[PDB]
Amino acid sequence: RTTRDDLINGNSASCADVIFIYARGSTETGNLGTLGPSIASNLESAFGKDGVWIQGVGGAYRATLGDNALPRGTSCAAIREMLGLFQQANTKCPDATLIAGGYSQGAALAAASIEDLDSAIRDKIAGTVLFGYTKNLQNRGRIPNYPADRTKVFCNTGDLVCTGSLIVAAPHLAYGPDARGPAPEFLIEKVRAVRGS
């Protein structure tokens, strides 16, 4: 439900084929927040419970609203935490296909982390979904150093954070349908395009 630590808790000897690392939005609970559980149950239906490990970004990522105003749209301590989980995934399960996602501050966190990631690990992230991406206009709908065909951004009309502002208006809170259908669909297509482990 809102906390999932399958990568940290998982046994190396029985690695999942797919590892999903997700960063929640500002002020959200657990380490998956409001959208992460919906994506997670749909990934589990497609790959089975032992086939996918879902891991939220917890630890130093406190999802403090004010950190949206920092240069990268989140704190450097939170980037170091997500970078460390991609590194843990690469070490603990070298043949697993990775997928990532984030909402709001967590989408800026996922973008910042993937930009700084070692190229050999970044290249294992088969697909990344970003909802209410706060750096959407500044980065022109892309994650730096990561291919457009592997990226899907969900930015609602009237969601002001997609258009260069940090005001939270009602469309920013309306990604529930996307997390239940097209965002898991995109992630499953991108994993099946390359395959699993």
Curated annotation (Swiss-Prot):
Its EC number is 3.1.1.74. One of its GO terms (biological process) is carbohydrate catabolic process. It holds the Pfam family Cutinase. The 2 disulfide bonds play a critical role in holding the catalytic residues in juxta-position; reduction of the disulfide bridges results in the complete inactivation of the enzyme. One of its GO terms (molecular function) is cutinase activity. It catalyses: cutin + H2O = cutin monomers. It is found in: Secreted. Optimum pH is 8. Keywords: Disulfide bond, Glycoprotein, Hydrolase, Secreted, Serine esterase, Signal, Virulence. Disulfide bonds join 15-93, 155-162. Catalyzes the hydrolysis of complex carboxylic polyesters found in the cell wall of plants. Degrades cutin, a macromolecule that forms the structure of the plant cuticle. Allows pathogenic fungi to penetrate through the cuticular barrier into the host plant during the initial stage of fungal infection. This is Cutinase 1.
